């Protein structure tokens, strides 16, 4: 339940949310950087930790949900095209990955949100985070915590966090990425500019 | 008889028959005209399409931006000699990094004909292939056949009713080499028309033309510019 | 290995030899018969000419690919088509079944296992050496959603979806009669599901009651293989039903 | 003896002239291309309509921009699908942008003829494939449709038909469809030539019926749609 | 840990050999004789460590060995010096000693190439390589006058051998000689105990 | 930055800042190696073709290898596809080479500047470390802060409530491109010598040199 | 031979009663119908001869290669089917391509001769693959034997050549060979007999027109195998037309 | 890995068994709303604890092996069987890149002696016993598991033992926890007992 | 400054441009380490038909390169008409093996100059022993790079008279400049001259070896 990625789910729909910013010390060389990458509105996944890696896996499962989708017609599990993915991170090691990736699609029993490692860990909950910053996200969101929580509250949250983040661990920067996965198929909220979110909050 | 029963088994001809069946497979594809100047190599191909409701495509295919070919005989035969063609473009670009050397291009291509030939009962490519080409040699158009022979051609052309275009090579044979760019693609069109009677001439619809050099990468044309090149009837009188 | 000249060729006739040869094997064969619950899918084959001094164990026509995945072959044609063919589908779907199965977290999508099956009986048919098995299966499972499916495959591996359908003894013979057979009204319980495979097998079979073996896969439980003392209580009820119904 | 993989006295492939009669046995591929999208329309090919047609396949998406319907040996047909699958989306995944149609065709073509008895392993040919493909999709120019066949000929078409009878198909066509018309009729160009094309009937269970469109993936109609076209002759 | 000098005479050729190895302290081997073949008209020596230029000696072996019957005539000397370059390239890390090529091709009767350990090959009137022959390195070169004659540099091969073995502590003192010529090899092993070893510092 | 090694720069920063019809590319002309030019022309910018360049930064050889890399896909997507490789694509290529290593990233950085098929003009960075993002400003190297804070300034204006320098402009652009280059060689030695201007707009790439600090 | 329905002239891995297969000989008889390739040994280097016949009026040398420069000392010049000619070039270039780049030193040619005729041999034994119809002759300047020039036939068979042709006319050219001393004569006379005798062999009622390829490996060059300077190749070809008249 | 805990106890035929909920990944609980307690078949059980993320990876492995298996037989599994094959595979995947490097735990019904439990450690030793301990826990829990019982035991003395053990490795041992799942497996069905 | 291997090495790289002809200066000598086992060196061949290669600093690349120029000078025979080779070709083709040469231990330099004018292009090219080549007008690398191109670069800086003959009697004060500067160099020396046409060149020569600090 860490990093810059984190998805929880809840009664009204669900969000996702990611930052866009990278480089820890004074070096930087990515500004607009999609930690939640989605080509496409049928799948979603989200990065973590070490910058390589999930860029990495994530553009092999990229091309995986785009496979099973085609040979099925209709789209497939959520499970199967994450699972598929998680038998290659294992093997993986062994090219300093350290891959802590969230997979999220819809899958027939309704959606499914996974939690992926580099060391092949699956298991489904309401909420995971990849990486190390939401080691600090978990306390203002747990305290508030409802899982019936408001359309409103949770955009309100999640603008919060991002603000009170840079306060607390810096690193945030240029844009704060929103993305909302309402029924079962996603859309992008708004690619809000930090300077707004430190006023708000 | 039975010395074509396979490619193995040798005719008291000196040639086996079924090398020459594969000349006859090239002969019933695509008029092609190929000549070249002394900067650029230009490849003038016939369209041909297997339906009323198509529009025509291309018979120029792409070795890449710098060799091409031009098909006649089966679609799918020389797309299986290209591949191969676009692996040592791929290969040239990493090694030398220049155009490969259209000569030495031509011999490897000869290798891989010359496999079947030699394997029981097999069957030896039935394209041929008008090859432009520049390095630093100069342009080169080649000649390639179902055998693993190429020649060196000032101006070829093979296909289909191809001796009414041969005959305007061998009129305008110096004149390819000194001219310009533009006007090497024309005589191609001049030439290409005369394999046509006179009732049949070319259109913008079903020419296509490949044209690689000095100055520039391989580009199709296939209503690209096709038509001030176009211009300017001369055919042959049937 | 595998031979230097190719079994299969291309050669006029409109398909090929040993799909035509392949045809005429799964025709000339026996009756067998799936037929698609709302409860268990289940499937049977007419023959294996049980006597008692014999049992079945792998012996079985119907082999389970998965936890809920199953598949019923007819190899069997005019002298006896084989199981050492079959095997081999078999073998190679099995494996594949069980990691779809890892993959999703839901009941194995029959769909993929079935598409599977008719790319591994077409793959032999292109490569050098070999030939199509002279098989046709009853690709059944249910789906990631609990759906139940009874597909079918011929020799050179073509699919369908089905409600039911029945192959060997003309092939198209069989399956217009299971139609016939078929009510919805009649799946909806573990045993009205079962005596709708049985009552199409019976038709022609000889001393029927014992070489009718059909067995049962429940929803990811692994298959239950009835032994055909247990089925033969089945076939004694329907058989006077049929009787009553003439 | 001597092979398939020689020549005739004609001086062609014995093979290759084998595969296109082949094709005739099967199914049907009319694809109409319109500028309003790609149409495919593909017969399932029935027994009865108690075939449940809640997955029977033949018009598949090769991609989520580009589908394909095929016609003539249906068994043969299935591997080159899901083969032609995993290409383009190699293809998809390395650019990152929406596939041509043009570049699909090409690409499976060279697959069509490395047979031989020789030269050749496993994973290779030992025969021509006799399937014909439609491709149909949108792409950044706009809706282009390509026909492939098992000599590897790739044409640009505005209306292209192959089946059951590859001419009667194509004969139909000329006089239905005129080249500047609407979405609506191009699906209704596609039922009445389906018939004289099939030896069999219009069922809603023996139709298969897909549409690619601008901003718009390959979408596979439902009992309903299917119906809707089907009333469309 | 050998002593090996091998000298070009402006006649034919003149070898000069150990008759002791030696490992860190003690003596590996007691009784020396080196002629790893390559052809039955062309020797090498293996110099300095003896495993490190032996299995370079061993790979030209074999392709000189397939060639000499192949040819039908034996290998030219040239031929062997290019083969022993071609290993020592690569295995430059495994390999850094010294190959000492010396006899007779068919192209001249006449060549002496030095295998250097940083590579090269080329001719010298005379080389010094191995344990005891590197203090007298620079020396070997200048001992010889250039193009000398056969007479002449027997007595030189001989008398720098003595003085390279009293130099290092990789030599003993017994001086085996080769003397090479159109004839084939004849060796020969000149007593020591007996002559005079070079003057000794006080 | 960049320092003896056994394989290392001298010379070479690549910035791209689009507008929304070109994309002025400056590199630094020089061949270095060891502390000391070995040639004053000839910058570590390579086109693949002349529709798109892209400048590899540092170790020499790994900068050869990833050109070929780009360019021989970009013929590929031509052949079959009868259109232009967008820069999206020559990009990806270029990934997979700086995926590969890891362990110990890639001793080259690279910034490819072209137009992807969307009709308008983008500028990829990827990094040797490998991430990688579209720009409107970048500044790519290891010393790619430097021209990559004047960008984020000049093109974007973040921070910035009344300063844009002057107004977005090709000519503009090409303005900044030369100063920084001068700029940056008093505090930084690393960067000198020559100043290569590339100009890419839909007229495509034509390449100047200028004489400087 | 026979023209038995199954194998011996439909197989080459079955012996006739005698012991041969007569695949080869059907294979020997494709050196004959074509124009001819000449070649012969001198002891300064060793000059080939190879007359192109102009088909086409739209053709220029290089075209229909029946001249190969093999290494850079070494030729090939070939008689018979051009297609099987290119296999037997492709093998000789890269086992004279190792020798010279590995060992330093120039190629004694018989081990050579020996080498490539095996493979032509090797082939001829399978059934699975084609006997060679065509005859080669490969040639070398070295510093171990000088000038050698040895002809592999269709069936591989080596044997050294003083001087050689293999063609369509191999009496009326063996013959003029014969007459004449080139066997120790210098390389440049050479190069004007090389190309009289293909004058002879060529007939202007059975050929319209040739052009000369001839090869150098000699004294002009100084070793160096090089087809032959356009000025060089001229004055040979005008010598054997001016000669015969 | 060197979190994680589990403990069996075998009973008459009855096993009890109990293992914390938590998967933390860092240094936080990634999941937890999920058990990874497996069932392999309807008869077998593997529980597996070591590596948070392992656990599944082992789990799959094993579930197709299982399987191949039991399609071999073409009747159910074997205890035997279940712990040496376990134990082979486990040791050659542990040096894979798609590791092992958990301590397992077999709950298998055996078809003809009865109820088996067999131990497996990180190592990977293989061991049929009636009192063992799994984890980082197997350290801390193996003695008190030898004393306990007398040859085997008794449910009511064990709900006790098991409590009294369950508050000293939140004490001492240290996981992040705050539920723990008891179950005890009779051999067919699968039981919940109550959580301390 | 970078140190080439120390080993075995022929030392000493100068190329600059001039009209139509490079001048380079090559060591005739073969240091093995610094001591001048073989003071006579072959370093200079003819990489292909008109095109020439003469390369300083490690040998063991240099070895490479003989095997490497071998066949690509065959191939380029067998046509029989040439292509009339240009320099990159070749260059690129060599890149590969100095980039495995780096590789072992204390990684080998080399320093190589291609002259070939074939097309209509005059293309000089320069290979680094990490594999960079490029086109140039004067190259250095190494110890070269710090020290005598510092010479070469001055005296071409006032006034740009770029002639064979400048360069030539620049290579001979040059030659006791170097002996007194560098330590793995002596003064027996091979003087190379490249063209469009070929390598021309002889090999040995010498000229003055003066210390310039004592007279001082």
Known sequence: TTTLAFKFQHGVIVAADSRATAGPYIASQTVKKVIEINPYLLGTMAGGAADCSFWERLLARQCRIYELRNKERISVAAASKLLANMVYQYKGMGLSMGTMICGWDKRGPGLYYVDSEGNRISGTAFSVGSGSVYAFGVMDRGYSYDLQVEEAYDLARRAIYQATYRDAYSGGAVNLYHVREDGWIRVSSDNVADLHDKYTS | NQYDNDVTVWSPQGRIHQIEYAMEAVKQGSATVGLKSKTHAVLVALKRAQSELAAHQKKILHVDNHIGISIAGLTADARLLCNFMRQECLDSRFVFDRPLPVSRLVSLIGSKTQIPTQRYGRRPYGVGLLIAGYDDMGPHVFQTCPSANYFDCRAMSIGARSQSARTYLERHMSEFMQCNLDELVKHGLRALRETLPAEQDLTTKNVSIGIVGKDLEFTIYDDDDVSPFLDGLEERPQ | MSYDRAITVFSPDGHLFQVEYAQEAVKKGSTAVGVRGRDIVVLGVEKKSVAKLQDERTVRKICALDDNVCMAFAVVASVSGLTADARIVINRARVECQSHRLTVGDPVTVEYITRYIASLKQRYTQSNGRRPFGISALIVGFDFDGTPRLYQTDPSGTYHAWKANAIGRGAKSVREFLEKNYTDDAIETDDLTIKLVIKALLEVVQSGGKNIELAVMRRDQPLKILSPEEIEKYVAEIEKEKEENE | DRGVNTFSPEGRLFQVEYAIEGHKLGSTAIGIQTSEGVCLAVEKRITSPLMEPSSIEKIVEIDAHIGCAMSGLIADAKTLIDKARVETQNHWFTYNETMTVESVTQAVSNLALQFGEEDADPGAMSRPFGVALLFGGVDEKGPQLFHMDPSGTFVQCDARAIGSASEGAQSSLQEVYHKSTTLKEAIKSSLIILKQVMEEKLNATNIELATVQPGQNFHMFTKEELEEVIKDI | ?202 | RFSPYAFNGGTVLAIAGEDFSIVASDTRLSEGFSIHTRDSPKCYKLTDKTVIGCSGFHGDCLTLTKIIEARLKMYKHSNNKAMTTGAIAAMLSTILYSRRFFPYYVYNIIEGLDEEGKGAVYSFDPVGSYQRDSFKAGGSASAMLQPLLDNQVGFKNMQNVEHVPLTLDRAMRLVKDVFISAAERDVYTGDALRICIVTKEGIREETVPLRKD | MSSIGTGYDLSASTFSPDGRVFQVEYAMKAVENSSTAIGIRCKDGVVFGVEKLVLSKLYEEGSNKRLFNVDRHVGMAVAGLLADARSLADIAREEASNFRSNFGYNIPLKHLADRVAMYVHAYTLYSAVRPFGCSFMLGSYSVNDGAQLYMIDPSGVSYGYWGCAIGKARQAAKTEIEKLQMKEMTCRDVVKEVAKIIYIVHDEVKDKAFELELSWVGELTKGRHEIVPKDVREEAEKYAKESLK | MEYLIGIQGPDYVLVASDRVAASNIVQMKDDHDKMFKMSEKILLLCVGEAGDTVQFAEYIQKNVQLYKMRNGYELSPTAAANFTRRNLADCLRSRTPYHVNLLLAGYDEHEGPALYYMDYLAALAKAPFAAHGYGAFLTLSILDRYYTPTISRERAVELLRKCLEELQKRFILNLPTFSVRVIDKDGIHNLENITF | TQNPMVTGTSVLGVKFDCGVVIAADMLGSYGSLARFRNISRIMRVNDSTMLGASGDYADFQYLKQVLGQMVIDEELFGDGHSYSPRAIHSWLTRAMYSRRSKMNPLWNTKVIGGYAGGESFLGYVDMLGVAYEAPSLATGYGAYLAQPLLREVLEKQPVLSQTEARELVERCMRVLYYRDARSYNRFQVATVTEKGVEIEGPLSAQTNWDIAHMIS
């Open chain 5, 1 to 202: 840990t050998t002593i090996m000098a091998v000298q070009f005479d402006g006649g034919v050729v003149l070898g000069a050999d150990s008759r002791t190895t030696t490992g860190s302290y003690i003596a590996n081997r007691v009784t020396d004789k080196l002629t790893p073949i390559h052809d039955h008209i062309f020797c090498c020596r293996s110099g300095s460590a003896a495993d490190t230029q032996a299995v370079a000696d061993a790979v030209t072996y074999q392709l000189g060995f397939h060639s000499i019957e192949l040819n039908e005539p034996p290998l030219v000397h040239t031929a062997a010096s290019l083969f022993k370059e071609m290993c020592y390239r690569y295995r430059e890390d495994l390999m850094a000693g010294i190959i000492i090529a010396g006899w007779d091709p068919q192209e001249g009767g006449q060549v002496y190439s030095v295998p250097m350990g940083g590579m090269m090959v080329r001719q010298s009137f005379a080389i010094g390589g191995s344990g005891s022959s590197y203090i007298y390195g620079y020396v070997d070169a200048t001992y010889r006058e250039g193009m000398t004659k056969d007479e002449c540099l027997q007595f030189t091969a001989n008398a720098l051998a003595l003085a390279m073995e009293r130099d290092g502590s990789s030599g003993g003192v017994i001086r085996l000689a080769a003397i090479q010529q159109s004839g084939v090899e004849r060796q020969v092993l000149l007593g020591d105990q007996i002559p005079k070893v070079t003057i000794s510092t006080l």
